[PDB]
């Protein structure tokens, strides 16, 4: 309530303008318009009102804070309706191909023998080899992205999904080291990696009200109820 | 119950999580040129 | 859509892991896996299985989770 | 007195629109007497459904406004004045008359129904008093809808 | 190959003949 | 009444499709199908089956839907 | 008849002898 008050506590009196967060001025017999400052978007180097709202978790009073408007609700729509929605789908689609490739090499991997030597000759030995390199390369990006997340915020469930991504990418890395080691057992680790990535992929659906609800419910079953029963 | 609670929240839950998704991307998108005025078209009477 | 993703991913994971018998095909393996999701299955036959200890664990992961969270989660939605 | 806004937002808004928006008889009266066009359509995005922009639609014409905002006296003065009586059957950009707009402005709350319902009544009483030949409730909006049929198309029960 | 006695079949077994992989240890036991 | 309609129609569809073994009769086939609805079944045996790929799909359709919507829908009604 | 090798049993198979219909492709494979 106070958050909303501080951002939107518009003031009108002499010297009012410097203090006020919101100015609204556009009314038709029906109708009204509200204008918001807005500082929270402006805060950056500090975590900020917007940053805190974006980041904040496990408090349990959050539904309300996220809901706050105009800017928090208003700001998000402006950010995403204009461009963000397009950006996410491209990310999701790009991820999906990585998955098809990781499975395809794994699906079509040669029994051998273990690991090398690999002929890498012809289309048959050429297509699979590209996939294997591509999948490992795909693996590195998650590991690099994850480290920053650990690196940016060393201190301390949530976030549940980012955490899973790090686990899978590492699993692939373990397989790769094994592959260089060339032990047969290394597969099993890769097999965990292929399936885990696919289960991870379902996450990208998030931000969709039908879809977003399902992922959240699944996350809830596994953090709490399954974990407790197990 | 977890499913039911999630359902009651989920217009709202769907809303908060999205914002988080947008924020992380914005932070990692290179802080590339992007918007950086808010107002909401309104019409309730109240008249 | 969700079950299809979980099922598809799991099937792909199985197909790579051990061709074995009847798991060689994705169309058959998916059918084998769907049967598991419906809750009718024959469990831990193993025989002719590589990473079966690795594999039994994989089956426990997939089957348990699928019966446990997707079916109940969809069913919870249904009431 | 008849110059209008040209930006996409307030497009076509005149001083008379504003006087009404502000519920100001005195200024409505004054503008009409110095010859404000009573049929001027305020049609910019500020006068249609929220982007959200928003908001807010009544559509367009002074009479329609004056009704949709529940302002009976001004509805009367628009239709009855010496200077320019409102055309009670005019259609906005969407084909809507004041009866159509009223249906659009309903939101199924008890006090909403109540005010729309009798302002509707009032318009008809004025139609029949002033211009008896006009079968008002038969007039179709762009999409082919009588006020009734719109009401029912949009669950305004 | 075949994981003779005391051979662990987590992967690549392929347990020999007289041996059989028992899904706990993953080693190969026979007799 | 509803289960009887779904079951009866499905049984008729099966009876035409492949007489096979034990599916030749409607009284037996219905019994075979009811067993599936109860949730006890043996799946994708196939053997001696025509349009089995066509048929496995049919079984997936009927069994899945029946377990999934009628039983849950009746059961949802029950609470 | 019998759908020899590369013979599709969606219907009418009746896959030959050495062949067996595998319920994905619906073609007949043997060996």
Swiss-Prot record, chains C, F:
Binding site for Ca(2+): 42
Intramembrane sections: 23-45
Effect of residue 32 to Q: Slight modification of pore attributes
Reported impact of residue 44 to Q: Minor modification of pore attributes
Modifications made to the protein after synthesis: Phosphorylation by CAMKII seems to regulate binding to vanilloids. Phosphorylated and modulated by PRKCE, PRKCM and probably PRKCZ. Dephosphorylation by calcineurin seems to lead to receptor desensitization and phosphorylation by CAMKII recovers activity.
Motif Selectivity filter boundaries: 39-42
Extracellular side: 46-53
Family: Belongs to the transient receptor (TC 1.A.4) family. TrpV subfamily. TRPV1 sub-subfamily.
Recorded domain comment: The association domain (AD) is necessary for self-association.
Entry protein name: Transient receptor potential cation channel subfamily V member 1
UniProtKB/Swiss-Prot annotation, chains E, G:
Domain remark text: The presence of a 'disulfide through disulfide knot' structurally defines this protein as a knottin.
Protein name: Kappa-theraphotoxin-Cg1a 1
Disulfide bonds: 2-16, 9-21, 15-28
Site positions per UniProt: Involved in active face: 30
Organism: Chilobrachys guangxiensis
Organism ancestry: Eukaryota, Metazoa, Ecdysozoa, Arthropoda, Chelicerata
Tissues of expression: Expressed by the venom gland.
Cellular compartment(s): Secreted
More about this protein: Negative results: does not show effect on Kv1.1/KCNA1, Kv1.2/KCNA2, Kv1.3/KCNA3, Kv1.4/KCNA4, Kv3.1/KCNC1 (all expressed in oocytes), voltage-gated sodium channels (Nav1/SCN) (from DRG neurons), and in a range of voltage-gated calcium channels (expressed in rat DRG neurons). Does not show significant toxic symptoms when injected into mice and into cockroaches.
Similarity comment: family membership: Belongs to the neurotoxin 10 (Hwtx-1) family. 28 (Jztx-11) subfamily.
Ranges where the record places region Involved in active face: 5-6
Protein task: This toxin acts as a voltage-dependent gating-modifier. It inhibits the sodium conductance (IC(50)=124 nM) and slows the fast inactivation (EC(50)=1180 nM) of Nav1.5/SCN5A. It significantly shifts the activation to more depolarized voltages and decreases the deactivation of Nav1.5 currents upon extreme depolarization, but only slightly affects voltage-dependence of steady-state inactivation. In addition, this toxin causes an approximately five-fold decrease in the rate of recovery from inactivation and an approximately 1.9-fold reduction in the closed-state inactivation rate.
């Amino acid at each position: 309530g106070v958050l909303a008050y501080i951002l939107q506590r518009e003031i009108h009196e002499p010297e009012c303008r410097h203090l006020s967060r919101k100015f609204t001025e556009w009314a038709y017999g029906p109708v009204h318009s509200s204008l918001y400052d807005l500082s929270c978007i402006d805060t950056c180097e500090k975590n900020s009102v917007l940053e805190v709202i974006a980041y904040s978790s496990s408090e349990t009073p959050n539904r309300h804070d996220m809901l706050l408007v105009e800017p928090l609700n208003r700001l998000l729509q402006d950010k995403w309706d204009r461009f963000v929605k397009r950006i996410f789908y491209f990310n999701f689609f790009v991820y999906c191909l990585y998955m098809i490739i990781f499975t395809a090499a794994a699906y079509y991997r040669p029994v051998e023998g273990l690991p090398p030597y690999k002929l890498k000759n012809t289309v048959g030995d050429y297509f699979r080899v590209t996939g294997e390199i591509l999948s490992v390369s795909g693996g590195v990006y998650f590991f690099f992205r994850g480290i920053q997340y650990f690196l940016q915020r060393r201190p301390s469930v949530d976030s549940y999904s980012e955490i899973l991504f790090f686990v899978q990418s590492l699993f692939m890395l373990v397989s790769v080291v094994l592959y260089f080691s060339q032990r047969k057992e290394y597969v099993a680790s890769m097999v965990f990696s292929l399936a885990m990535g696919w289960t991870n992929m379902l996450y990208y659906t998030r931000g969709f009200q039908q879809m977003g609800i399902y992922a959240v419910m699944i996350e809830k079953m596994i953090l709490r109820d399954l974990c407790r029963f197990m | 119950e977890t499913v039911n609670k999630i359902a009651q929240e989920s217009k709202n839950i769907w809303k908060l999580q999205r914002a988080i998704t947008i924020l992380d991307t914005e932070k990692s998108f290179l802080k590339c040129m992007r918007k950086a005025x808010x107002x909401x078209x309104x019409x309730x009477x109240x008249x | 859509f969700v079950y299809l993703v979980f099922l598809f991913g799991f099937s792909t994971a199985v197909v790579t892991l051990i061709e074995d018998g009847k798991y060689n095909s994705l169309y058959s393996t998916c059918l084998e896996l769907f049967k598991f999701t419906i809750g009718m299955g024959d469990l831990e036959f193993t025989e002719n299985y590589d990473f079966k200890a690795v594999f039994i664990i994989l089956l426990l992961a997939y089957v348990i989770l699928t019966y446990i969270l997707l079916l109940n989660m969809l069913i919870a939605l249904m009431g | 007195v008849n110059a209008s806004y040209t930006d996409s937002y307030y497009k076509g808004q005149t001083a008379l629109h504003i006087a009404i928006e502000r519920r100001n008889m005195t200024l409505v009266t004054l503008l009409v007497e110095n010859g404000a066009d009573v049929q001027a359509a305020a049609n910019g995005d500020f006068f249609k459904k929220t982007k959200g922009r928003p908001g807010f639609y009544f559509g367009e014409l002074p009479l329609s406004l004056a009704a949709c905002t529940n302002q009976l006296a001004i509805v009367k003065f628009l239709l009855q004045n010496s200077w320019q009586p409102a055309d009670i059957s005019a259609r906005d950009s969407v084909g809507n008359t004041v009866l159509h707009a009223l249906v659009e402005v309903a939101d199924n709350t008890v006090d909403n129904t109540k005010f729309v319902t009798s302002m509707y009544n009032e318009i008809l009483i004025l139609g029949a008093k002033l211009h008896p030949t006009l079968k008002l409730e038969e007039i179709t909006n762009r999409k082919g809808l009588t006020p009734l049929a719109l009401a029912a198309s949009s669950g305004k029960i | 190959e075949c994981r003779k006695m005391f051979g662990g079949c987590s992967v690549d077994s392929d347990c020999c003949a007289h041996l059989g992989c028992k899904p706990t240890l993953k080693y190969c036991a026979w007799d």
